Design an enzyme around this catalytic site. Structure first.
Site, PDB file in Angstrom:
ATOM      1  N   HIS A  41      32.595 -11.116  51.939  1.00  0.00           N
ATOM      2  CA  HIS A  41      31.461 -11.517  51.061  1.00  0.00           C
ATOM      3  C   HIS A  41      31.649 -10.890  49.668  1.00  0.00           C
ATOM      4  O   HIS A  41      30.934 -11.324  48.723  1.00  0.00           O
ATOM      5  CB  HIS A  41      30.092 -11.307  51.724  1.00  0.00           C
ATOM      6  CG  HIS A  41      29.627  -9.892  51.812  1.00  0.00           C
ATOM      7  ND1 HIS A  41      29.225  -9.338  53.008  1.00  0.00           N
ATOM      8  CD2 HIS A  41      29.542  -8.909  50.889  1.00  0.00           C
ATOM      9  CE1 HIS A  41      28.860  -8.084  52.809  1.00  0.00           C
ATOM     10  NE2 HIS A  41      29.064  -7.789  51.527  1.00  0.00           N
ATOM     11  N   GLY A 143      25.800  -2.054  47.672  1.00  0.00           N
ATOM     12  CA  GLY A 143      27.048  -1.440  47.198  1.00  0.00           C
ATOM     13  C   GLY A 143      27.713  -0.644  48.320  1.00  0.00           C
ATOM     14  O   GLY A 143      28.881  -0.262  48.137  1.00  0.00           O
ATOM     15  N   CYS A 145      28.450  -1.746  51.325  1.00  0.00           N
ATOM     16  CA  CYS A 145      29.244  -2.640  52.181  1.00  0.00           C
ATOM     17  C   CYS A 145      30.719  -2.287  52.022  1.00  0.00           C
ATOM     18  O   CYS A 145      31.116  -1.942  50.942  1.00  0.00           O
ATOM     19  CB  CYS A 145      28.951  -4.112  51.914  1.00  0.00           C
ATOM     20  SG  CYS A 145      27.540  -4.642  52.924  1.00  0.00           S
TER      21      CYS A 145
HETATM   22  C1  LIG Z   1      26.142  -3.791  52.154  1.00  0.00           C
HETATM   23  C2  LIG Z   1      25.941  -4.293  50.735  1.00  0.00           C
HETATM   24  O1  LIG Z   1      26.401  -3.658  49.793  1.00  0.00           O
HETATM   25  N1  LIG Z   1      25.275  -5.449  50.535  1.00  0.00           N
HETATM   26  C3  LIG Z   1      25.201  -6.116  49.238  1.00  0.00           C
HETATM   27  C4  LIG Z   1      25.792  -7.504  49.338  1.00  0.00           C
HETATM   28  N2  LIG Z   1      25.116  -8.306  50.362  1.00  0.00           N
HETATM   29  C5  LIG Z   1      25.721  -9.636  50.453  1.00  0.00           C
HETATM   30  C6  LIG Z   1      25.210 -10.415  51.638  1.00  0.00           C
HETATM   31  C7  LIG Z   1      25.816 -10.476  52.929  1.00  0.00           C
HETATM   32  C8  LIG Z   1      25.053 -11.087  53.861  1.00  0.00           C
HETATM   33  S1  LIG Z   1      23.588 -11.612  53.207  1.00  0.00           S
HETATM   34  C9  LIG Z   1      24.032 -11.153  51.634  1.00  0.00           C
HETATM   35  C10 LIG Z   1      25.187  -7.601  51.649  1.00  0.00           C
HETATM   36  C11 LIG Z   1      24.576  -6.224  51.554  1.00  0.00           C
END
Ligand SMILES: *CC(=O)N1CCN(Cc2ccsc2)CC1
Ligand SMILES: *CC(=O)N1CCN(Cc2ccsc2)CC1
Lengths: 304, 304
Positions: A41, A143, A145
């Site tokens: 993502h 951030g 992730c």
């Molecule tokens: C964990 C993190 O940093 N985030 C920010 C980006 N998001 C993207 C997303 C993935 C599934 S729904 C939206 C995830 C959480």
């Protein structure tokens, strides 16, 4: 003496953390040998997250679109591929701090340490478990992730988790390092509810053994029970059914303390039925289920 | 979202841990620049620990009696001195992994991470607080002595604790890195009872703010209170008196949540008076007091 929620020393993993930027999205990557692992993502705009077609989105990306920074040094991307829900970015330099490592997919009830990172920079370390509903109860802001979960056996880091998303109930979902989600979760901004968060019975028993080993014995009683009888009580309180496999795994703790596993089950049964009556066990007012029998033996024996 | 008991990344400190052996006693040392810091009781036999005269015991020791091992490499001791309750062993090699560091003596209520080590080898990391009775609630077996407690500000490790002893009640006592014990404790095998373990009121309030920030709001009520009124209740429940200084320190959390500090005190007052009624707050069934306001802001803001 004393018993604490204890994470692996994080240094070996701190040395693997990098920043990955695709376009305007930044998260964490894991640099092992000449590969950087990050959630796919990274390639999405928030707009994209509603119903992303990752293969279609990825066609628009080249090696030079993935900005990979280790400290204040940029890594050169010489290849990229999607494996399930993770990207593998081939870089032209092996990470000199690559530890011995394995990728392992853990089972529910298994514990691991998380190194929470922002912009490839570690902020802190805490201990998790894979819940029976395949969520984990983490501490993860935007951030975070690409932050990873791991166990260490002496010199070998076993990577089991990469952080991908937060459910609107504030619990956490992610992948093993092959990019396969734990449980039914998908990396899309849709309706994803967690199932029942059942209590990890074998972990609670292990922790009750830890309590006895450290002086907390008030909950020990005169009773015993059977697996079948205990399990009637576990069912009622959303505890995992206890198996002979769980009884076997608790054998070393049984041996050391001289308390029969089924006697400790009868203690747990009375605690479920009667509550703590405002008392505590190893400084907790509820039944801790994120210590494995292996964790209890480790912390009680001082393994490095 | 989510809120976890979180330790500093340990790598910078892992790089400072060595094994110190004097005669038949082994514990941990902290190698910063060309000095190794360890508890002075390294020079004692268990026999010696009843009423040791450390200056007299130390006259019998030479530089070559202190065996200092970093990994599988031996360090050459070129000098030794006692400062309060620690030994400083001058070695002929600066630790190449010496981080930026400070030695700080913390106040009660201040939190820090502990890297538990055995034989100069890290076993795990957990978060502590200096209790109001100058004990800490640790996880420390024989051989863990010389393990250190620390905070990190970006690149600078502030060492605040070195582990020296366990009280027969299973709580922990130790020194700052100048070798001065926290509280009245002495490195002798004698009758040392901890005072009242009072609850760190400002930390509980900080954690209640953390709870609101993360969705747990059931304990918010329609009441307010005054410092003087709150303190009558704190007295009764062995809580530290709340000062205007504590109110000031909670200002940023007050600002972010829009809940007046005194309103949150009235929430805490009702929880003290009524209990949790079998409910939980950030997965705890008791009032957590080992998060500082600074800790809550850090974890809620994602500082690295
Ligand atoms: C964990 C993190 O940093 N985030 C920010 C980006 N998001 C993207 C997303 C993935 C599934 S729904 C939206 C995830 C959480
Ligand atoms: C922390 C640790 O490893 N130990 C073992 C040595 N003990 C010596 C002692 C100090 C005060 S009373 C006896 C301390 C605990």
């Amino acid at each position: 003496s004393g018993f604490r929620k204890m994470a692996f020393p994080s240094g070996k993993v701190e040395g693997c953390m990098v920043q990955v930027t695709c376009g305007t999205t930044t998260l964490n990557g894991l640099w092992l040998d000449d590969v950087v692992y990050c959630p796919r993502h990274v390639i999405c705009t928030s707009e994209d997250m509603l119903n992303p077609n990752y293969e279609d989105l990825l066609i628009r990306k080249s090696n030079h679109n993935f900005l990979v920074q280790a400290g204040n040094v940029q890594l050169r991307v010489i290849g990229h591929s999607m494996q399930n829900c993770v990207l593998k970015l081939k870089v032209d330099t092996a990470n000199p701090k690559t530890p011995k490592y394995k990728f392992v997919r853990i089972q529910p009830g298994q514990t691991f340490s998380v190194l929470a990172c922002y912009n490839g920079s570690p902020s802190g370390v805490y201990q998790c478990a894979m819940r029976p509903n395949f969520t984990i109860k983490g501490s993860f802001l935007n951030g975070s992730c690409g932050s990873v979960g791991f166990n260490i056996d002496y010199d070998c880091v076993s990577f089991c988790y990469m952080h991908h998303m937060e459910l609107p109930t504030g619990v956490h979902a992610g992948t093993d390092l092959e990019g396969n989600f734990y449980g039914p979760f998908v990396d899309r901004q849709t309706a994803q509810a967690a199932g029942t968060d059942t209590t990890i019975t074998v972990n609670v028993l292990a922790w009750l053994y830890a309590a006895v080993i450290n002086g907390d014995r008030w909950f020990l009683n005169r009773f015993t029970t059977t697996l079948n009888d205990f399990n009637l009580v576990a069912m009622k309180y959303n505890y995992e059914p206890l198996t002979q496999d769980h009884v076997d795994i608790l054998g070393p703790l049984s041996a050391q303390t001289g308390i029969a596993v089924l006697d400790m089950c009868a203690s747990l049964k009375e605690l479920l039925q009667n509550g703590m009556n405002g008392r505590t066990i190893l400084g907790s007012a509820l039944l801790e289920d994120e210590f494995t029998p292996f964790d209890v033996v480790r912390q009680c024996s001082g393994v490095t």
